[PDB]
Amino acid sequence: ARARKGALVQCDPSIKALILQIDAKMSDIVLEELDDTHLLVNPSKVEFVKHELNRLLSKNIYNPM
Amino acid sequence: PADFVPDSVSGMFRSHDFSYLRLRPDHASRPLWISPSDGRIILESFSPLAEQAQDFLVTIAEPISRPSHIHEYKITAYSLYAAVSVGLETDDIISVLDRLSKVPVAESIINFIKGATISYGKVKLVIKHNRYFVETTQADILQMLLNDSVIGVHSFEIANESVEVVKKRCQEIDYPVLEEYDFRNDHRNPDLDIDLKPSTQIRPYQEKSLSKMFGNGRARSGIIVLPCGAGKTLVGITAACTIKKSVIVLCTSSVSVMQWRQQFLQWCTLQPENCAVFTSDNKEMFQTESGLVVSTYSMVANTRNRSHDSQKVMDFLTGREWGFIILDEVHVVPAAMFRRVVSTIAAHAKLGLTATLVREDDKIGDLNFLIGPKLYEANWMELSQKGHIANVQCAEVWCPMTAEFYQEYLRETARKRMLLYIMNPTKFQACQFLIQYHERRGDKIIVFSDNVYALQEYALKMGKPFIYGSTPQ
Amino acid sequence: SLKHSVTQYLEEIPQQVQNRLYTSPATCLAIYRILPPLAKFFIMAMVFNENEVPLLDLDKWVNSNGKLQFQNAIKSMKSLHLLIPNKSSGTLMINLNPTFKISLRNALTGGEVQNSFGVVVEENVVSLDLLDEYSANKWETILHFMVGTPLAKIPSEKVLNLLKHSKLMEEVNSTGEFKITNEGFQFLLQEINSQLWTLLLQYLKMIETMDLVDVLHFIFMLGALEVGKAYKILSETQRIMLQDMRDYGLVFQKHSIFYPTKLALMLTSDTIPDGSLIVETNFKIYSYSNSPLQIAVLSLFVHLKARFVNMVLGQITRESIRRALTNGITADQIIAYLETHAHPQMRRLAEEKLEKKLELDPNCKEPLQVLPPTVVDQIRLWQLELDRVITYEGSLYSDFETSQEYNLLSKYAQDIGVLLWKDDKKKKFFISKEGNSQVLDFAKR
Amino acid sequence: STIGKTALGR
Ligand SMILES: Nc1ncnc2c1ncn2[C@@H]1O[C@H](COP(=O)(O)OP(=O)(O)O)[C@@H](O)[C@H]1O
């Protein structure tokens, strides 16, 4: 009997690996690893990781002009 | 734009709003829209006069995008420079544009056209006995050109290698040079007796391009752009057969040269004795007075190392004053040194043939003073729907990388991830399934692969042959 | 959807209020037209006879084929309490509401009406020059403020308050700006008649304590009135209601006499194209439209680059598409707009494409796609990109003493539909924050 | 148009 507040992130192995790299550089990002598709993350860092992940993924996308 | 109230949405268009003008009463018939700022032309291909405008717009404006319904061209300085040469003046252009334009032509557009359309036709580059002479039919031009820092019925010599410099200087200065060859009155160059046999056929677009090239009757110099497989070989053969002068063709391959020659002989009545192939294997040249030399850029642009036979061939090429040069895949001529061949090799007429007139660097614009402007371009979907070319269902397959390789993708550097995401198993599995399905459908399949290691791995895995640079002819 | 929405709102009203609503013939004439044709036929049959007819006699009229329509007609008529079913002598007799009957009789036979339809001042004005311009300008201003394009004369606090308090035009003071929503885009996609009905319905729901029956009296009487003529001024609530309706561009006041406008008649019943556009394979849009409303709505999902008098040219980009999606607009709605505003050239080419498809294989009737499938695929793929990352709020349960207890709790969560993931090997599971309290209570019990 | 299908693979 123990409850822990947090944010559940559901994704695929690739996004999970990206999140693992981000957490390895910043341990506080991921609070815990649930499964190969689920990670428990800090509520405060959700709004920051979303924006930073969008910035990181922008590289793989070609946006002319 | 006087006493014209802006709309509430005018802010969204930053200096692009074109509502300050009014529409003519005959808008329902006039198919053209003109951009007063960017120079873009919107053409209605589903309205009367669309056919009459489709060729004039191609002549005066470069195509940006030409989808099914609405065509998009653009007027530029280079396009106007190309148009002003073939018997076209601002007066005629403006007359046709006004007669076909829903909106009146703005004073800014008129000024832009006038500035560039009145600076052509005062200098001519001629060649006499392997000497390049910059002949001008007027003398008063000297008082400015000879007084300019770079330059220096009257004719003066110019260094052959300095052609690439003088032509660019001419582009910068008001007057650019035009290379016209009156083969009818050209008797010094020995003639070659080759004609197209009756089996030859000219497609309507090929005939239209030839008309745009020979409308005045004097052969000009420039570039021709046709889709791959449109018949560029036949276009070149027709040009050579109608000019009837000594010609040298430069092609960027040996198999291409072989088929070039094979089609050359098949399509025209060229006698084998008058034909010569200049490649690495055999270097013999025709002993007849006039013939054709088909070689490659590697065999014409090299200056340091040459064989004994190849040195004799190069001396022959330099000593003789050629009459026509045909550059296949001309998009490589503006390279660091390939541009040197244009200045060194002597020829009265230069034709380039290429399906694409674009390249990564900014040297594409140098083609204007290297070989001349573009002459003709042909649409792809138009020919596809007219049956001249095939229709393609282009598809992009998204192969998800598996976690095992993606985890290494994250850590690996830039150089290794290239092989990593190219050798993913999902691509192999999809390729195998598609190969089986299409083989049951009875299709002839080509699999391209730039990476030699990936090509070899796929070939050895699937039991199928691979071809790359190491493969012999 | 017009009649359906109006009928739904009228059905939700209490019977006590409906009985008083049927007092004026003006409201009855408007309500009568909204019912299905079979219901209207039955109502017209019953209005002129002062007797009771059994339901079986009405059933006899309908043929076997229209037996299904009979059920819908009777259900709709009974929902509004228009027909009062009285059972006596072993027969389910059917009778019409006396107030509705008398109102219809007065309206049809020109009986006493108590000036429900109003009077005439015989002082006509120029409808085209003034009424049309006034209503067009005011409706354009409200729609411009809705689409978000800058506009000088902002709408009045009345309509602004209605907009905010309604689901339409979500606003936040912390952000300090107003933005459109999914329902907003649907409203803009709806026709003029439904566009007016939506706002009027929202006003009807918003008003509190101005009688509900009086509001419908005024609206239906306004629908009754004809444009281009004067009408002398009515209820005390209806005076302020008329002033408020002037804020929606429906009725024009000099600054004593009010005049209905084209939208007033548009309220009652319905009544190259402007708005038709061409979409190219290069993700380019060329809309042969000259209207700031259309330009602004196109700007939602088009990265506008320039414009001409006759048309507007733009380019579809990931940024514009993401903006539209973030506003809550669905790709289905976007393609619906494009399809219903497709150019005749696009429609003809698509018809030829379908003809070629059927000629090649007439066995299968492929759907008619006006615009190339690649654009649809790209838009849906961008929506999938936005939906790539999926996150939920909740808590994780672990360290279960017994597998039986773990299975019991997980199964209870699954039964109540608050289970998102489970693993038997690890004896762990995750539940939604909404069901966290229920799961905890069940665990305690 | 096969967008909603599960991705290809083993
Ligand atoms: N007018 C034509 N009549 C017959 N065949 C033609 C014609 N134009 C092109 N072809 C054919 O098109 C193919 C490609 O010709 P080729 O000159 O190699 O094109 P390119 O050099 O532009 O790739 C050849 O099979 C050629 O015979």
Side-chain angles (χ1 to χ4, degrees):
Chain A
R2 191 221 72 173
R4 201 203 180 162
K5 288 199 197 330
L8 171 79
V9 169
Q10 193 277 298
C11 68
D12 51 62
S14 299
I15 298 283
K16 194 213 84 177
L18 271 156
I19 290 163
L20 289 178
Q21 297 303 140
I22 295 283
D23 186 74
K25 190 196 303 188
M26 294 299 293
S27 83
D28 189 60
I29 298 295
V30 171
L31 300 172
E32 191 178 328
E33 309 189 26
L34 303 174
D35 187 65
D36 207 356
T37 65
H38 291 78
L39 303 162
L40 185 64
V41 303
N42 181 270
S44 84
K45 312 300 173 217
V46 185
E47 67 92 32
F48 179 66
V49 67
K50 186 175 180 178
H51 185 274
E52 197 66 17
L53 192 146
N54 281 124
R55 201 257 285 169
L56 266 297
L57 276 178
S58 184
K59 302 182 168 72
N60 299 351
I61 293 155
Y62 164 61
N63 290 334
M65 295 294 102
Chain B
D3 192 351
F4 160 76
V5 306
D7 196 359
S8 44
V9 290
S10 172
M12 292 177 181
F13 310 100
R14 54 189 80 266
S15 164
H16 283 310
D17 187 355
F18 308 135
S19 288
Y20 58 79
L21 55 84
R22 64 172 183 182
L23 213 66
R24 264 197 269 280
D26 204 6
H27 65 92
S29 179
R30 295 163 184 269
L32 296 174
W33 288 303
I34 298 152
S35 179
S37 78
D38 288 15
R40 292 182 295 101
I41 285 161
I42 315 307
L43 172 72
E44 282 190 348
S45 184
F46 47 73
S47 53
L49 309 153
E51 300 155 14
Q52 205 272 2
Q54 192 163 251
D55 308 331
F56 165 84
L57 284 193
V58 163
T59 309
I60 59 155
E62 57 167 339
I64 279 169
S65 79
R66 293 165 287 187
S68 178
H69 304 282
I70 299 293
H71 283 354
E72 195 176 343
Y73 299 91
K74 165 166 178 177
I75 290 177
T76 56
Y78 290 128
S79 68
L80 267 168
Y81 162 55
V84 66
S85 67
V86 60
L88 269 174
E89 192 48 271
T90 303
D91 288 345
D92 185 2
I93 280 174
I94 292 296
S95 174
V96 173
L97 197 67
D98 186 2
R99 185 169 58 80
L100 301 174
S101 169
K102 307 164 146 82
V103 298
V105 182
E107 294 176 350
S108 164
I109 290 289
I110 284 160
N111 288 9
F112 185 72
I113 292 164
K114 300 253 188 199
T117 317
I118 205 76
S119 72
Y120 177 83
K122 298 292 181 65
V123 62
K124 305 172 172 182
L125 190 152
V126 303
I127 314 166
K128 280 192 80 57
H129 322 295
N130 294 72
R131 288 137 65 74
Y132 271 33
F133 284 5
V134 185
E135 181 179 0
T136 77
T137 187
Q138 299 279 357
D140 200 4
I141 179 172
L142 62 84
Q143 184 156 317
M144 52 172 187
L145 271 74
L146 275 291
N147 275 292
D148 284 328
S149 296
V150 186
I151 295 98
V153 193
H154 78 100
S155 173
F156 56 98
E157 65 89 12
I158 197 173
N160 211 0
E161 207 277 342
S162 192
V163 164
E164 194 158 310
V165 175
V166 73
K167 273 196 176 187
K168 180 175 81 72
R169 186 72 257 173
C170 278
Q171 175 59 29
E172 288 291 332
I173 206 157
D174 54 352
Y175 301 145
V177 75
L178 77 165
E179 197 172 10
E180 294 211 347
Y181 190 68
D182 187 1
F183 57 90
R184 303 253 181 251
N185 301 317
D186 192 283
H187 293 89
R188 285 142 287 167
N189 293 324
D191 285 345
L192 167 64
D193 53 353
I194 59 171
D195 303 312
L196 284 159
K197 66 180 69 160
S199 159
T200 53
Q201 292 177 335
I202 305 295
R203 274 162 191 179
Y205 59 89
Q206 300 179 349
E207 180 174 9
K208 289 274 204 77
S209 56
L210 293 159
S211 77
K212 301 272 182 194
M213 179 171 174
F214 295 109
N216 61 87
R218 286 191 173 181
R220 301 170 183 276
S221 298
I223 314 163
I224 288 163
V225 175
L226 308 169
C228 294
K232 281 188 289 302
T233 308
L234 182 48
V235 166
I237 297 161
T238 310
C241 287
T242 191
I243 286 157
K244 297 181 191 193
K245 297 290 184 181
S246 295
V247 56
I248 186 163
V249 184
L250 314 184
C251 203
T252 178
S253 165
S254 282
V255 182
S256 301
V257 161
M258 182 67 75
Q259 293 177 335
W260 260 97
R261 180 178 179 181
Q262 185 64 60
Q263 270 201 349
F264 201 113
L265 287 167
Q266 156 175 328
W267 287 102
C268 65
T269 58
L270 163 70
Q271 303 299 321
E273 302 155 29
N274 271 279
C275 183
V277 62
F278 184 43
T279 178
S280 294
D281 283 298
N282 50 355
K283 328 203 196 282
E284 81 295 9
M285 290 295 182
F286 53 85
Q287 47 266 20
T288 315
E289 203 165 17
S290 291
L292 187 153
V293 165
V294 58
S295 64
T296 180
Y297 276 104
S298 296
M299 294 297 291
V300 171
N302 293 159
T303 61
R304 183 175 175 275
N305 57 2
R306 301 285 289 173
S307 177
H308 158 274
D309 195 3
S310 298
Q311 181 51 58
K312 183 177 178 180
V313 183
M314 179 66 181
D315 274 302
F316 178 75
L317 266 76
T318 306
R320 182 171 292 181
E321 179 182 1
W322 297 103
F324 203 81
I325 187 163
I326 310 183
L327 305 170
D328 199 50
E329 312 294 353
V330 70
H331 67 266
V332 309
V333 75
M337 185 173 281
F338 275 10
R339 55 204 275 164
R340 197 176 293 279
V341 302
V342 176
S343 75
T344 55
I345 301 292
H348 311 75
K350 317 187 218 296
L351 195 80
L353 291 158
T354 182
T356 58
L357 190 50
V358 302
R359 58 173 297 165
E360 184 61 20
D361 54 41
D362 183 65
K363 300 190 180 282
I364 195 73
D366 296 358
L367 288 166
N368 297 286
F369 57 69
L370 289 164
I371 55 183
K374 171 161 59 62
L375 300 154
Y376 172 79
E377 180 157 340
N379 312 321
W380 301 64
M381 294 300 293
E382 195 203 39
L383 303 185
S384 285
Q385 66 177 23
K386 280 162 72 184
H388 287 142
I389 68 180
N391 279 103
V392 304
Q393 290 286 112
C394 283
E396 177 182 1
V397 183
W398 276 13
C399 294
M401 208 202 272
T402 182
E404 297 302 319
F405 291 96
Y406 197 58
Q407 185 62 62
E408 290 294 317
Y409 181 85
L410 269 299
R411 69 179 69 250
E412 283 298 332
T413 181
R415 294 181 181 174
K416 185 71 172 180
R417 59 179 183 185
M418 294 177 71
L419 174 82
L420 178 63
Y421 66 65
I422 297 168
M423 300 302 291
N424 55 353
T426 307
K427 197 181 283 180
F428 271 92
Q429 294 179 356
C431 194
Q432 182 172 2
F433 171 62
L434 289 180
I435 279 165
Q436 163 159 310
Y437 202 95
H438 286 287
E439 278 198 71
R440 189 186 297 108
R441 292 181 66 261
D443 279 4
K444 293 261 197 213
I445 302 179
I446 290 163
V447 185
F448 279 129
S449 188
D450 188 4
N451 190 358
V452 304
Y453 176 55
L455 188 79
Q456 288 198 57
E457 196 64 26
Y458 270 79
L460 270 69
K461 183 62 175 66
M462 292 177 182
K464 294 173 182 71
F466 59 92
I467 290 161
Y468 74 99
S470 85
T471 310
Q473 186 173 355
Chain C
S1 64
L2 297 157
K3 295 187 176 182
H4 301 291
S5 279
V6 185
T7 304
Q8 202 214 50
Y9 180 66
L10 294 173
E11 282 175 353
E12 290 294 329
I13 309 312
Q15 179 175 21
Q16 317 318 317
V17 179
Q18 290 170 353
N19 190 33
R20 193 172 62 268
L21 175 58
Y22 301 151
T23 306
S24 80
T27 55
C28 295
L29 181 54
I31 296 169
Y32 177 45
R33 296 172 176 152
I34 294 169
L35 277 74
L38 209 74
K40 284 188 282 198
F41 176 69
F42 296 147
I43 291 291
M44 185 51 55
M46 211 87 74
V47 74
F48 281 116
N49 66 329
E50 287 284 356
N51 288 104
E52 295 176 350
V53 72
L55 190 86
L56 309 189
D57 287 344
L58 289 170
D59 190 5
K60 296 298 292 189
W61 284 82
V62 184
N63 195 292
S64 178
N65 188 277
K67 170 57 68 143
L68 175 53
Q69 292 193 7
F70 183 44
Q71 182 63 256
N72 188 32
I74 189 66
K75 188 267 183 181
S76 195
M77 294 157 81
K78 213 194 280 198
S79 171
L80 282 80
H81 295 267
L82 188 58
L83 284 179
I84 301 177
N86 185 305
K87 65 179 73 175
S88 178
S89 296
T91 43
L92 184 68
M93 301 296 290
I94 293 281
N95 199 338
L96 194 72
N97 187 308
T99 69
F100 189 75
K101 200 171 200 164
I102 293 170
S103 49
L104 294 178
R105 176 174 297 143
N106 293 323
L108 293 174
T109 69
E112 70 283 5
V113 65
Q114 294 177 335
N115 290 338
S116 72
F117 297 101
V119 302
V120 296
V121 190
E122 306 284 13
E123 185 66 18
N124 57 3
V125 304
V126 292
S127 74
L128 181 71
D129 314 329
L130 267 293
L131 277 288
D132 198 321
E133 192 276 330
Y134 169 84
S135 176
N137 174 84
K138 183 67 181 294
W139 190 246
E140 192 73 21
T141 53
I142 188 68
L143 291 178
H144 280 189
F145 189 87
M146 183 175 281
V147 65
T149 183
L151 193 145
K153 166 52 159 144
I154 52 161
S156 69
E157 63 271 9
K158 292 286 183 65
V159 61
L160 184 57
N161 205 42
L162 183 145
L163 278 167
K164 173 48 170 38
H165 291 262
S166 302
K167 291 178 179 179
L168 280 295
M169 183 179 283
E170 198 270 3
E171 304 183 352
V172 180
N173 191 30
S174 85
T175 72
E177 292 177 350
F178 53 89
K179 297 191 168 198
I180 308 101
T181 66
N182 195 320
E183 282 283 84
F185 194 65
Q186 291 190 358
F187 171 85
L188 293 178
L189 288 180
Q190 282 155 13
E191 54 259 27
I192 183 60
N193 202 345
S194 185
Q195 281 171 358
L196 197 71
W197 275 107
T198 292
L199 298 170
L200 276 169
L201 173 60
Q202 274 300 308
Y203 187 94
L204 294 174
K205 189 184 284 295
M206 180 179 79
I207 51 161
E208 193 68 19
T209 184
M210 292 177 180
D211 202 348
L212 181 50
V213 305
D214 293 333
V215 191
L216 300 165
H217 287 94
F218 191 68
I219 291 164
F220 297 160
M221 179 281 313
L222 187 144
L225 309 170
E226 53 184 355
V227 69
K229 287 182 183 175
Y231 292 94
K232 202 167 282 298
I233 197 171
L234 195 75
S235 177
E236 295 176 350
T237 66
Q238 276 167 352
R239 261 188 274 290
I240 187 69
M241 195 185 296
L242 171 65
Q243 274 291 82
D244 198 304
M245 209 83 84
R246 184 168 181 276
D247 279 315
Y248 276 98
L250 279 66
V251 65
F252 177 66
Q253 279 190 10
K254 265 205 173 180
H255 187 278
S256 66
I257 55 179
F258 71 92
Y259 288 70
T261 312
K262 185 186 285 183
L263 310 189
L265 270 167
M266 181 66 75
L267 188 144
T268 305
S269 293
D270 192 71
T271 310
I272 53 178
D274 205 284
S276 48
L277 59 86
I278 287 155
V279 188
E280 309 290 6
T281 68
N282 194 33
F283 289 89
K284 295 280 193 67
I285 290 166
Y286 306 76
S287 164
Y288 285 63
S289 54
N290 189 25
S291 44
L293 176 64
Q294 300 298 310
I295 301 152
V297 70
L298 266 74
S299 184
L300 294 174
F301 55 85
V302 181
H303 173 264
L304 296 173
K305 280 149 91 164
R307 178 182 71 169
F308 298 86
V309 169
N310 194 15
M311 57 86 67
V312 177
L313 73 165
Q315 186 195 359
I316 294 169
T317 65
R318 215 175 68 106
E319 293 84 357
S320 49
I321 285 298
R322 281 204 164 197
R323 190 196 313 143
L325 296 171
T326 297
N327 308 139
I329 301 174
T330 316
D332 207 343
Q333 301 180 50
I334 289 162
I335 62 169
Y337 187 78
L338 272 66
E339 189 188 344
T340 198
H341 297 90
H343 204 270
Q345 299 287 337
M346 293 262 292
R347 187 148 288 128
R348 283 201 304 198
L349 186 62
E351 184 177 2
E352 291 178 350
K353 183 177 179 180
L354 186 151
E355 282 307 289
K356 177 60 173 170
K357 195 81 163 162
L358 270 285
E359 176 176 2
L360 180 64
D361 282 336
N363 290 336
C364 57
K365 288 190 176 176
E366 301 286 1
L368 178 60
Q369 58 202 343
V370 300
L371 59 89
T374 49
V375 177
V376 184
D377 302 4
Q378 194 64 259
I379 294 169
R380 287 145 90 207
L381 286 157
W382 284 329
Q383 201 171 263
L384 293 172
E385 289 180 349
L386 296 172
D387 292 5
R388 192 69 171 289
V389 68
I390 295 279
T391 73
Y392 319 87
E393 298 160 6
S395 303
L396 187 86
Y397 286 68
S398 59
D399 293 329
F400 279 92
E401 292 287 329
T402 316
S403 172
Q404 287 84 305
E405 197 196 8
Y406 154 75
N407 272 284
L408 173 71
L409 273 290
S410 81
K411 189 59 161 51
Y412 175 71
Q414 183 65 43
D415 299 347
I416 61 166
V418 307
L419 187 66
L420 310 177
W421 168 88
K422 77 182 184 83
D423 187 286
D424 291 354
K425 301 291 189 292
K426 311 295 294 310
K427 293 195 188 66
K428 295 192 209 232
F429 63 84
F430 191 98
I431 56 172
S432 71
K433 180 170 72 63
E434 300 175 354
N436 188 4
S437 80
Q438 297 168 89
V439 167
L440 296 162
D441 199 358
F442 188 86
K444 269 77 181 176
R445 285 196 176 88
Chain D
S1 295
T2 69
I3 297 89
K5 304 293 180 69
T6 188
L8 77 165
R10 51 185 309 288

